[PDB]
């Protein structure tokens, strides 16, 4: 048996090491946005609060995780805030990746009243809410769901431990039912399904908003070849109804209406010689078409599948940051299934349960380098933060 302190002088660097690197990451995050006015928005606000939670992961629950480790003599209920903090950081983060979720199923699927719907003074009081709701949920051991009512006497005499205290061990003090199906199935588990299903939404209607646009240009050029090559004034008739209808679906900023003014102009123009048996006059009047898609409908649909894709792309950058939480923290919530769930199974070894650990703290330092490569606002702002 190696003296103790060896294996934890490892465990406590590397700590420390993740405590500072969450530190500066997540202040050069939140330096970023109250620097920069174009990374003020309420996603962004849900960024912030994500990025604080890391800061306390550093400044407070790092070192508690360190403290508990020695399993030291302890009052039980002090014992259980040290455990139990990290869960309210933990718990935060999962509020704040939910929202910025949601944030961007909302931008997407409703653009047109997200800005009325979705505000800074609103997300301000929702941060304020999860914020709350992470204590009672990461604390709710506190409230009287905790071993301290059964403390291990024969491990708190041999430590030394005066009366009314216990050796402070986080499995000794936070009941294991607590941990599987309060923390991990209902306030962990199910709240990251839920996010996969608000992806899921936000792809799929990506795909369909740009599938429908592609809809729209196929509709107009497929039409125009009809007209064309019609032969009575009816086949005319039905394409530009069609086109017509096509027209004001794709027009559902000044440039834009211009544009759309002319081609629905342009299209009842040739409607009215068309109920009037004129095709010859029809289609060459539905020619002029070609000059207003070239000019201005064209230029509106590479500006909108455009936009669609950096929306995309953006959609994709939180997705991983709420894979790369799920990364981190399943281990070890996996990890205390197996104690919970298998009492016959031997239980982890003590080099695994540090590694679940401090991988779960890593967690706190890899969100900054993903807005660093994925976000040029950001990566932008950085660079003159650092320079500066
Ligand atoms: N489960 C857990 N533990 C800790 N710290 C104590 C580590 N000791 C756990 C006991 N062990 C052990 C016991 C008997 C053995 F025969 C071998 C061993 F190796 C030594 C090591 N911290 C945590 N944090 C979260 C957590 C936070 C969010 C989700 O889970 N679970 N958790
Ligand atoms: C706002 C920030 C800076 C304040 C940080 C306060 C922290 C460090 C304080 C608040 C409550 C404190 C705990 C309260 C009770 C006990 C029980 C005692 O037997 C050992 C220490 C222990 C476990 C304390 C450790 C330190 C502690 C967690
Ligand atoms: C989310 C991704 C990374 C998957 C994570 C898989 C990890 C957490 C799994 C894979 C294999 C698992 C181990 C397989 C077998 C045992 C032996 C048992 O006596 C205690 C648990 C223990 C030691 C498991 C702990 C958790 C474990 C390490
Ligand atoms: C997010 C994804 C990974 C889904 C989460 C799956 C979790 C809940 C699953 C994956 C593997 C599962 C474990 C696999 C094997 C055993 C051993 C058995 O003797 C008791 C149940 C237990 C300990 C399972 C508990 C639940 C478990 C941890
Ligand atoms: C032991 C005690 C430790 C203290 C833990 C306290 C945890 C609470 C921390 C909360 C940090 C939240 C920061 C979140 C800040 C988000 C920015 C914001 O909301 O502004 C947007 C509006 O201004 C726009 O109108
Ligand atoms: C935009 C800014 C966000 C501000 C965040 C607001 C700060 C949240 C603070 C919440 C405190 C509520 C705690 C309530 C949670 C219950 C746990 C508890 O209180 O246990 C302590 C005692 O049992 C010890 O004996
Ligand atoms: C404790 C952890 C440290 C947390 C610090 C949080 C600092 C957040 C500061 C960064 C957010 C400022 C902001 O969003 O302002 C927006 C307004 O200008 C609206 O226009
Ligand atoms: C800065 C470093 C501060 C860390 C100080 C923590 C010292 C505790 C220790 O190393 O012994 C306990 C272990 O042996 C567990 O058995
Ligand atoms: C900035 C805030 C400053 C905070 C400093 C606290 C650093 C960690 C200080 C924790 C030291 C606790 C200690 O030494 O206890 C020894 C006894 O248990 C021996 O029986
Ligand atoms: C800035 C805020 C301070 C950040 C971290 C403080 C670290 C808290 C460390 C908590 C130390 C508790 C302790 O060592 O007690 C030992 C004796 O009570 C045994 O009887
Ligand atoms: C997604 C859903 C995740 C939860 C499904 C996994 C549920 C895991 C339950 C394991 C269980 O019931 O064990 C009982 C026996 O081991 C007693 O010996
Ligand atoms: C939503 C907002 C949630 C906050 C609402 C109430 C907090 C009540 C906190 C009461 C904490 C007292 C617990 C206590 O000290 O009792 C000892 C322990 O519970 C026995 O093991
Ligand atoms: C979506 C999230 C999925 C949440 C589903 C949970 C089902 C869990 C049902 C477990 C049924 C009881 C298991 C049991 O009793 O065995 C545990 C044992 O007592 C340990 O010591
Ligand atoms: C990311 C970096 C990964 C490096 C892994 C080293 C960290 C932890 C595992 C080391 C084993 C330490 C056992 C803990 C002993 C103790 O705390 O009493
Ligand atoms: C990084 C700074 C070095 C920390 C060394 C840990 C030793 C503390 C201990 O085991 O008592
Ligand atoms: C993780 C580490 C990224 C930190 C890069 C250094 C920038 C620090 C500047 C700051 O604290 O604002
Ligand atoms: C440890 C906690 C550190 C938190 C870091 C958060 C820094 C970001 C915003 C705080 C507000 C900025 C205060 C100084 C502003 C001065 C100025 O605007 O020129
Ligand atoms: C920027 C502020 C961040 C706070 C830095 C604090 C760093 C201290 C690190 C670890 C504290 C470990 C406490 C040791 C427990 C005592 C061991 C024992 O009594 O047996
Ligand atoms: C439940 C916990 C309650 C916390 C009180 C926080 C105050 C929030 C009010 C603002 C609501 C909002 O504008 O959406
Ligand atoms: C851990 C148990 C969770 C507690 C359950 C219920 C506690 C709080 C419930 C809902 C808070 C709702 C927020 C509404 C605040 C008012 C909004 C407004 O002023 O417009
Ligand atoms: C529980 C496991 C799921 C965790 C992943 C959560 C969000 C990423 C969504 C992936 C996009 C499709
Ligand atoms: C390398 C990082 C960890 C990789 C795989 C985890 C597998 C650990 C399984 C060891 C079984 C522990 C035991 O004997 O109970
Ligand atoms: C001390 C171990 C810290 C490891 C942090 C890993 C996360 C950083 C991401 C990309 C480089
Ligand atoms: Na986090």
């Given amino acids: 048996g190696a003296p103790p302190i060896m294996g934890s002088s490892v465990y406590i660097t590397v700590e420390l090491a993740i405590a500072v690197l969450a530190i500066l990451g997540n202040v050069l995050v939140c330096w970023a946005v109250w620097l920069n006015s174009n990374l003020q928005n309420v996603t962004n606000y849900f960024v912030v609060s994500l990025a604080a939670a890391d800061i306390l ?12 480790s020695t399993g030291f003599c302890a009052a039980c209920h002090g014992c259980l805030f040290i455990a139990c903090f990290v869960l309210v950081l933990a718990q935060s983060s999962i509020f704040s990746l939910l929202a910025i979720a949601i944030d961007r199923y909302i931008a997407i699927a409703i ?4 800005n009325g719907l979705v505000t800074g003074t ?22 009287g769901w905790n071993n301290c009512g059964q403390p291990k006497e024969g491990k708190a005499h041999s430590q030394g431990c005066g009366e009314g205290q216990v050796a402070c061990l986080f499995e000794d003090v936070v009941p294991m039912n607590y941990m599987v199906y309060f923390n991990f199935f209902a306030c962990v588990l ?22 429908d646009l592609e809809d729209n240009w196929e509709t107009l ?19 530009l109804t069609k086109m017509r209808a096509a027209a004001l679906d794709a027009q559902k900023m000044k440039d834009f209406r211009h544009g759309f003014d002319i081609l629905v102009g342009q299209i009842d123009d040739a ?22 898609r070239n000019a201005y409908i064209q230029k509106y649909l590479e500006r909108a599948r455009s936009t669609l894709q950096k929306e995309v792309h953006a959609a994709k950058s939180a997705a991983i940051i709420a894979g790369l939480f799920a990364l981190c923290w399943l281990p ?5 299934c197996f104690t919970f769930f298998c009492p016959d199974c031997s239980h982890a070894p003590l080099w695994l349960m540090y590694l679940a650990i401090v991988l779960a703290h890593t967690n706190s330092v890899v969100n900054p380098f993903i807005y660093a490569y994925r976000i040029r606002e950001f990566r932008q702002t950085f660079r003159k933060i650092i320079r500066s």
């Fill in 221 to 239: 050029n497929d039409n125009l070849k009809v007209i064309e090559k019609a032969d009575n004034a009816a086949q005319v008739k039905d394409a």
């Fill in 111 to 114: 653009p047109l009243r997200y």
């Fill in 57 to 68: 992961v550093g400044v407070l629950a790092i070192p508690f995780a360190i403290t508990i």
């Fill in 271 to 292: 409607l009215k010689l068309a109920n009037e048996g004129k095709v010859k006059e029809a289609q060459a009047a539905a020619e002029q078409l070609k000059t207003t």
């Fill in 190 to 211: 199910v709240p990251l399904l839920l996010m996969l299903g608000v992806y899921l939404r936000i792809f799929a209607a990506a795909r369909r908003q740009l599938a």
């Fill in 122 to 143: 609103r997300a301000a009081g929702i941060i304020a809410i999860c914020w709350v709701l992470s204590f009672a949920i990461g604390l709710t051991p506190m409230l």
């Fill in 332 to 336: 070890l919530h996996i990890i205390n």
